[PDB]
Design a protein around this nucleic acid. Structure first.
Ligand code: ZN
Ligand code: ZN
Length: 44
DNA sequence: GTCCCTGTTCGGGC
């Protein structure tokens, strides 16, 4: 299993997901930066 | 793609 960032549902990933993906931060939510970039709750 | 499998956004990898 692998929790898809885009939709949440397991068994597949963000790229695989048959759904339009997110622009901004996946975890924190806020755009203008990715989850990678994020300075908010940056730890995991 | 049933699943793999993660920042850039589809494509081989099994
Ligand atoms: Zn998905
Ligand atoms: Zn963020």
């Amino acid at each position: 299993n692998v929790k898809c960032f885009n939709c949440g549902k397991e068994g597949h990933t963000a790229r695989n997901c048959r759904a339009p993906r997110k622009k901004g931060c996946w975890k924190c939510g806020k755009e203008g930066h990715q989850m990678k970039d994020c300075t908010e709750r940056q730890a995991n």
